[PDB]
Design a protein around this nucleic acid. Structure first.
Lengths: 98, 51, 38, 32, 273, 252, 98, 47, 166, 75
RNA sequence: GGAAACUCAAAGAGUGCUAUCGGAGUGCGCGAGAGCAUUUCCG
C-alpha cells in the first residue's frame, strides 16, 4: 500500500517472478518486489547460504507465537484496519446467529 | 593421556584465536544470546505443543 | 615400411614444456608536483 | 606377506614417515 | 568455507578404502590430514601452480601405493568398488580447477594433456577434445598448441579431415608465423604419402599430385611476405622510393630464406614428383 | 617467589612454538636472506629446495656434506617438526646442528653457505634455541653483513649481553666491544669449551684462530695492570694454549 | 608400558606462511554442540527481525505515469522488460522497464 | 503435521552447520522453487 | 539471453562467456549498479573464454579502422567463427552482446546464427569489463593496455588526418 | 558404528505419509553423513595401556610419563 | 618536558583476496548427446 496510490485496477507478475507491476487510478504504474526483502544483486555463496538457511528456519518455526506475532503484523492503513475490524465483528455476529 | 578431548570444533571453541576472530565470536554469541527462559530440564522441549 | 618410419613428423615443443628442468639460485636482498622547501 | 621395498619407499613418501630420519640422525650423528 | 566441502566430498573413498582392509585407520587419518593441509594451501588466498603440482604428485603417489597394497594384500588388480576410479576422478578435478584458476602456464596445461592422453583408455577422447578446445580458445596465438594436438589427432587417431580442419583454422588465426605454414606442408605431404602408400598396398595385394602443397606454398609466400612487410613499417606506411625498394629487397631475402628451407625439408621428404 | 619470573621462565622455554598467527609471523619473519615482507610468505619447500641446491654446491666444493644431505636436509625434514618429539631426539638434533655449525663455520664468505644454513635457521629455529653455538661459531666475521644480519635476527643470550646496542643499528659492532665481550671470564670459559670442541673435531682454521689470538692478546692487554684479574685469568688461556698446542696444524 | 599424548604440533593448525587461511578443524558431536533447538530458534527470531528490518518493497515508478489512471496492463511473454499500459483517455504506452 | 508426534519428528533434527555436515547442510537448505536468476520463466509444455 | 559478450581492446579481441545473468528489471537500482563497480561480484558474472591478440601494429591499426567505420575484419571474424557455437534451429540462435548498433548488421550479415544485442545491459556489462580492464584477463597477455592504446591512438589520428610527414 | 553418539531422539493422508517418509529419511541420511565425519577428524586420542599383568596403570608417575611424553606437553 | 616502538594489550579508519557406476555397445534424441539404463565387450 502507499499513500499516493488510489484504487489499484491492474496487477501483473513479471516474467522474472520477482517483480509485481501494479497500476493505480492516480495515473502511475508502480513496481514492487514480491519478496519484500530479497534483494536483486547476485550474491556470494556464503551470503546465499545464510539467506536460504535462515529462511528455511523461519519456514520451519513459523508456528511459534512470538515470531508469528512479529512476522505477521504490518502497518495496514487505518481505513483498511478499521473497516476489516468492523467486517470481522459483523462476521462473528452472523456466525453466532447461524 | 585420555583425559582431554583431542579434536575441538573451531566454530565455537578455538585455542588458536586472533583478535579478529575473538571479536567475531563475541559479536556472534551476543547476537545469539539465548533468552533466560529457555533453560528447562530438557532443552529439546521448546519445539513441542503446549500440553 | 622403413620409408613410413623414416618420414618426418610434426615438431612441437609442448611436451618439452611439460618435462623441462631448471637450476637457478636466488641472490640475496619529492614528487613531480611538490615545491622545494625554503 | 611383508612390505615390499618400493612399496615401503612410497609409504615413507605418502605417510610422511620421519622414523627413518630419526633413526639415521640418532645413529650416525657423531662421526670423524 | 568450501575447503570443508571438498574434504567432505572425498570421504567415501576412504570409507570403502578402510572397509576393505588395505588401509587402516591410523594411516588413513594421516593421509587425510595431509590432504587437508594440501587442500587449504590449494584454496588459500593467492595460491600457486607449484602447490597444484605437488598436490597432484601426492595423489598420484597415493594411487600407486593403493594399487600396490591391492596387489599385495587382496592379490587382485581391480577391486570393482569406489576405491579405484576415485583418485583419478580427484586428479581430474584438480587439473580442471588448476586450469581454471591459472590459465597462462603451458607447463601445467601440458601436464594435464599428457595425463589425460595416458588415461585415454579409461576416459576417451571427448575430454581431450573439450580441454584442448578450451586451451585453443584461451591461447589462439601460440602455434605450438595447434601443432601439438594436430600431431595428436594425426598420430593417435589419424583423422585427416579434422587434422586439415584445425591446421586451416590455426593458419587463419595467425598467418604470420613460418613454422605453422611449414609444418602444415609437412603434414600435407605425410597425408599424400600415406595415400599413395595405400594405393601401392592395393597394387601389392593385386590428379592427386602435390598441388595441395603447391597452393599452400603460394599462399604461404604471398601472406608471409605481406605480414613481414606489416611487421615492419609499424604504423605509418613509409613513403620514400629507395626505402620502399630496399625493404622489398629485404622481404625478398627473408621469403627466399623460407623457400630454401622448404626445398631442404622437402628434399629430405621427396619420394614423389 | 615471583610469578612473573616463573612465567618468563616458561616464556623463554616456549618461545619456539607458534600459538597464533601473529606469533607465527613474528617467529617466521626472522630470516637470514630476505626481509620481512618477502620472508613472511615463504613456504617451507621453497627455501628447502634452494637450500638443497646450496648444499649441493657446498658439497661439490667440500666433501663432508653428503651425510647432511642424507640426514638433516632430507625430503622428510620439511615435515619433521622441532618441538613435537622427545627430549632424547631434541638432544640428538641439537648436537647435529652443533656439528653442522662448527663444520660450516669456515665457509661464511659464500652465498651457498648462507642460503644453505638459512634453511635450518628458518625451520629448526636455531635463531632462538640453539643460539650460542651460532653466535660463537660465526663470531669471527664480526665486520660482515652476514654477522649484522645474524645479530639482528637473533635474541641475545645473557653472556653476549654487551652486543645489545647493535640490534637494529646499521653500524657493525667494533673491535673494542668485541674485547669487552671477551673480557669477562664467564664468557671466556664458554668460548674455550667451544674452541677445544673445535680442536678435537679438527676444524680449526686460519681466520678464527687469528681472531681468537687477537682477542686473547687484547684481553691480556686490558688486564695488563690488574694483578688479581691476571692471576684469575691464567688457567683459562694457559689451559687452552696447552690443548691448542696438542693439535697438529701450524696455524693453531 | 606404552603411553601417548595428543600432539597439537602447531603447523596443521596455525599456518606456515601468512596469507593462507588457517584451519577450522571440525567435530560434529552433539556433545560439543549442546543447545541445538534453542540456538536455531534464536537464529529464526533474528531472521524474522532482520526480515522486518529489510522489508523495503517499493522499487520505483516508471515515467511520469499516464494521464488519468490505468485500466489495462499487458506484460509480454517472450521478453522480460517490456510492458504495455493502456489508460483511460485512449492512451496506450509500451514501456522498457530496464 | 496433524499431531504432536509428527510435529516433534519433523523438528527433531537441526539444520545449521554446527550440527550437520556440509553436504547434508547444503542439501537440507535450498528453496522448493529454485528459479533461474534473470530470464523468462515459460509455461511447461512437455507431453 | 546475453550469454556471449565481445570486447575489443587495443592489444586484442576478447570474447567472454556470460556465466549467470544480470537483473534486467531492476537494472537501475543502486544495489545492482554498484556490482559493476566492485570486482568481487563482476567475476561472478563474466569470465574470460577467449582472447586473441592481433600482434602486428599495422594490423592493429587496420582492425581499429574497420571497427571505427563499423565493419568486420579478419581477426574478429576468425575468433567469432572459432568461439561462437552453431546454435541449431531446434533450440535457438546464439546471442552476442556487442557494443554498437553500427557494428550489429555487419556481423548479422556474415554470421546468420549469431544475433547481436546492445541494450543498456550490454552497455553497462561492456562498461564493467572496460572498468576492470586487466584484472579480468588473468595473465593471458604480454604488455599493458595504456602504452599500446597511446600508440594506436596516435596512429589512428594520423591515419584520419592523413598528415603529411614530409 | 558411531551413530549412537550422533542420534537425536499408519496415517490416513497420503501427502502427509509421503512427507513423514521424507523427513525421517532426511533424518537418517543426515545422521549417517554426520557420523561419517570422524573419519576426517584430525587426530586420535591418547592412552596409557598396561600391555602386561604386572605393569599396572597406576604404578606410573610423572617422572616416567614426562620422560616418554612429548617436549611440548612436558613444557 | 622530547619521545627510541624493537615490551605488549584494547580498539578506529584506509588499502588489497576467492567459487558451487568408467569407456563403448544396445531401445534410444536432430555428421549428433547435454541424458534416460545395463547382462551386451566388459572392467
Amino acid at each position: 500500500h502507499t499513500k499516493r496510490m488510489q484504487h489499484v485496477f491492474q496487477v501483473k507478475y513479471s516474467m522474472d517472478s520477482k517483480y509485481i507491476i501494479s497500476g493505480s487510478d492516480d495515473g502511475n504504474v508502480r513496481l514492487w518486489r514480491s519478496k519484500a526483502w530479497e534483494r536483486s544483486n547476485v550474491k556470494t555463496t556464503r551470503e546465499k547460504n545464510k539467506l536460504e538457511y535462515d529462511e528455511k528456519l523461519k519456514e520451519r518455526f513459523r508456528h511459534m507465537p512470538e515470531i508469528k506475532r512479529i512476522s505477521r503484523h504490518r502497518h495496514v492503513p487505518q481505513v483498511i484496519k478499521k473497516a476489516q475490524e468492523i467486517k470481522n465483528i459483523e462476521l462473528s455476529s452472523i456466525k453466532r446467529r447461524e | 593421556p585420555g583425559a582431554g578431548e583431542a579434536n575441538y570444533d573451531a566454530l565455537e571453541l578455538n585455542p588458536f584465536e586472533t583478535k579478529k576472530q575473538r571479536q567475531e565470536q563475541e559479536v556472534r554469541t551476543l547476537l545469539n544470546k539465548l533468552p533466560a527462559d529457555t533453560i528447562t530440564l530438557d532443552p529439546n522441549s521448546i519445539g513441542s505443543v503446549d500440553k | 615400411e622403413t620409408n613410413l618410419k623414416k618420414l618426418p613428423k610434426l615438431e612441437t615443443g609442448f611436451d618439452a614444456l611439460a618435462n623441462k628442468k631448471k637450476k637457478k639460485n636466488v641472490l640475496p636482498s619529492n614528487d613531480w608536483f611538490t615545491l622545494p622547501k625554503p | 606377506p611383508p612390505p615390499d621395498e618400493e612399496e615401503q619407499l612410497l609409504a615413507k613418501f605418502v605417510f610422511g614417515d620421519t622414523t627413518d630420519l630419526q633413526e639415521n640422525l640418532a645413529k650416525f650423528n657423531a662421526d670423524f | 568455507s568450501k575447503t570443508r566441502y571438498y574434504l567432505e566430498q572425498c570421504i567415501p573413498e576412504m570409507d570403502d578404502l578402510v572397509e576393505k582392509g588395505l588401509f587402516t585407520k591410523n594411516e588413513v587419518s594421516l593421509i587425510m590430514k595431509k590432504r587437508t593441509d594440501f587442500e587449504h594451501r590449494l584454496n588459500s588466498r593467492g595460491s600457486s601452480i607449484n602447490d597444484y603440482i605437488k598436490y597432484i604428485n601426492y595423489e598420484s603417489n597415493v594411487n600407486k601405493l593403493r594399487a600396490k597394497r591391492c596387489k599385495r594384500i587382496l592379490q587382485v588388480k581391480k577391486t570393482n568398488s569406489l576405491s579405484d576410479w576415485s583418485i583419478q576422478q580427484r586428479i581430474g578435478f584438480i587439473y580442471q580447477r588448476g586450469t581454471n584458476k591459472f590459465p597462462q602456464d603451458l607447463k601445467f596445461w601440458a601436464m594435464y594433456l599428457n595425463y589425460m592422453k595416458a588415461r585415454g583408455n579409461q576416459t576417451s577422447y571427448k575430454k581431450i577434445h573439450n580441454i584442448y578446445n578450451q586451451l585453443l580458445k584461451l591461447h589462439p596465438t601460440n602455434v605450438d598448441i595447434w601443432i601439438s594436438c594436430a600431431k595428436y589427432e594425426y598420430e593417435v587417431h589419424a583423422n585427416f579431415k579434422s587434422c586439415r580442419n584445425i591446421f586451416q583454422n590455426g593458419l587463419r588465426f595467425n598467418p604470420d608465423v613460418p613454422k605453422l605454414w611449414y609444418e602444415y606442408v609437412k603434414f600435407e605431404l605425410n597425408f599424400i604419402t600415406k595415400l599413395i602408400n595405400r594405393r601401392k598396398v592395393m597394387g601389392l595385394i593385386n590428379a592427386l599430385r602435390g598441388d595441395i602443397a603447391l597452393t599452400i606454398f603460394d599462399v604461404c609466400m604471398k601472406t608471409l611476405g605481406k605480414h613481414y612487410i606489416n611487421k615492419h613499417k609499424g604504423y605509418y606506411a613509409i613513403s620514400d622510393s629507395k626505402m620502399n625498394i630496399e625493404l622489398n629487397k629485404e622481404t625478398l631475402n627473408y621469403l627466399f630464406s623460407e623457400s630454401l628451407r622448404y626445398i631442404k625439408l622437402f628434399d629430405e621428404f621427396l619420394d614423389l614428383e | 617467589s615471583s610469578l612473573s619470573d616463573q612465567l618468563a621462565q616458561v616464556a623463554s622455554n616456549n618461545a619456539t612454538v607458534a600459538l597464533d598467527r601473529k606469533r607465527r609471523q613474528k617467529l617466521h619473519s626472522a630470516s637470514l636472506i630476505y626481509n620481512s615482507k618477502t620472508a613472511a610468505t615463504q613456504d617451507y619447500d621453497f627455501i628447502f629446495e634452494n637450500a638443497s641446491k646450496a648444499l649441493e654446491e657446498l658439497s661439490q666444493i667440500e666433501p663432508k656434506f653428503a651425510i647432511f644431505s642424507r640426514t638433516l636436509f632430507s625430503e622428510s625434514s620439511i615435515s619433521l617438526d622441532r618441538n613435537v618429539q622427545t627430549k632424547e631426539e631434541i638432544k640428538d638434533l641439537d648436537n647435529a646442528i652443533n656439528a653442522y655449525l662448527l663444520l660450516a663455520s669456515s665457509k661464511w664468505y659464500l652465498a651457498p653457505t648462507l642460503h644453505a644454513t638459512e634453511w635450518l635457521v628458518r625451520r629448526f629455529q636455531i635463531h632462538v634455541k640453539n643460539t650460542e653455538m651460532l653466535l660463537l661459531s660465526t663470531l669471527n666475521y664480526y665486520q660482515t653483513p652476514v654477522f649484522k644480519r645474524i645479530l639482528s635476527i637473533i635474541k641475545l643470550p645473557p653472556l653476549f649481553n654487551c652486543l645489545s646496542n647493535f640490534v637494529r643499528s646499521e653500524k657493525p659492532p667494533t673491535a673494542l666491544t668485541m674485547i669487552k665481550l671477551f673480557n669477562d671470564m664467564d664468557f671466556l670459559k664458554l668460548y674455550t669449551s667451544y674452541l677445544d670442541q673445535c680442536i678435537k673435531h679438527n676444524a680449526t682454521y686460519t681466520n678464527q684462530l687469528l681472531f681468537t689470538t687477537c682477542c686473547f692478546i687484547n684481553v691480556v692487554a686490558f688486564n695488563s695492570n690488574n694483578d688479581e684479574k691476571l692471576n684469575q685469568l691464567v688457567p683459562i688461556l694457559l689451559e687452552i694454549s696447552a690443548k691448542l698446542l696438542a693439535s697438529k696444524s701450524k696455524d693453531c | 608400558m606404552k603411553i601417548k599424548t595428543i600432539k597439537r604440533s602447531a603447523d596443521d593448525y596455525v599456518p606456515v606462511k601468512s596469507t593462507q587461511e588457517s584451519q577450522m578443524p571440525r567435530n560434529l558431536n552433539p556433545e560439543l554442540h549442546p543447545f541445538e533447538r534453542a540456538r536455531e530458534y534464536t537464529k529464526a527470531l533474528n531472521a524474522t527481525k532482520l526480515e522486518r528490518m529489510f522489508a523495503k518493497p517499493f522499487v520505483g515508478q516508471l515515467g511520469y505515469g499516464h494521464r488519468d489512471g490505468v485500466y489495462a496492463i499487458a506484460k509480454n511473454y517472450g521478453s522480460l522488460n517490456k510492458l504495455a499500459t493502456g489508460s483511460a483517455d485512449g492512451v496506450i504506452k509500451y514501456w522498457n522497464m530496464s | 503435521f496433524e499431531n504432536r508426534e509428527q510435529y516433534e519428528r519433523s523438528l527433531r533434527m537441526p539444520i545449521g552447520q554446527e550440527w550437520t555436515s556440509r553436504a547434508s547442510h547444503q542439501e537440507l537448505i535450498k528453496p522448493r522453487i529454485m528459479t533461474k536468476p534473470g530470464q523468462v520463466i515459460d509455461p511447461l509444455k512437455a507431453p | 539471453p546475453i550469454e556471449y559478450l565481445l570486447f575489443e581492446e587495443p592489444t586484442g579481441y576478447a570474447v567472454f562467456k556470460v556465466k549467470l545473468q544480470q537483473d534486467d528489471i531492476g537494472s537501475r537500482l543502486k544495489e545492482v549498479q554498484e556490482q559493476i563497480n566492485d570486482f568481487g561480484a563482476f567475476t561472478k558474472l563474466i569470465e574470460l573464454v577467449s582472447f586473441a591478440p592481433f600482434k602486428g601494429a599495422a594490423e592493429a591499426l587496420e582492425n581499429a579502422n574497420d571497427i571505427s567505420e563499423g565493419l568486420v575484419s579478419e581477426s574478429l571474424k576468425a575468433i567469432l567463427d572459432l568461439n561462437l557455437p552453431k546454435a541449431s534451429s531446434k533450440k535457438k540462435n546464439i546471442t552476442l552482446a556487442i557494443s554498437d548498433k553500427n557494428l550489429g548488421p555487419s556481423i548479422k550479415e556474415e554470421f546468420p546464427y549469431v544475433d547481436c544485442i546492445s541494450n543498456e545491459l550490454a552497455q553497462d556489462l561492456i562498461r564493467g569489463v572496460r572498468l576492470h580492464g586487466e584484472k579480468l584477463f588473468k595473465g593471458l597477455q604480454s604488455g599493458d593496455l595504456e602504452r599500446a592504446q597511446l600508440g594506436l591512438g596516435h596512429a589512428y589520428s594520423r591515419a584520419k588526418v592523413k598528415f603529411s610527414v614530409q | 558404528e558411531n551413530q549412537n553418539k550422533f542420534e537425536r531422539s499408519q496415517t490416513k493422508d497420503k501427502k502427509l505419509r509421503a512427507g513423514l517418509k521424507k523427513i525421517d529419511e532426511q533424518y537418517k541420511k543426515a545422521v549417517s553423513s554426520a557420523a561419517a565425519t570422524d573419519y576426517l577428524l584430525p587426530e586420535s586420542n591418547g592412552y596409557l595401556e598396561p600391555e602386561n599383568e604386572l605393569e599396572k596403570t597406576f604404578k606410573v608417575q610423572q617422572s616416567e610419563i614426562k620422560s616418554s611424553v612429548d617436549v611440548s606437553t612436558a613444557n
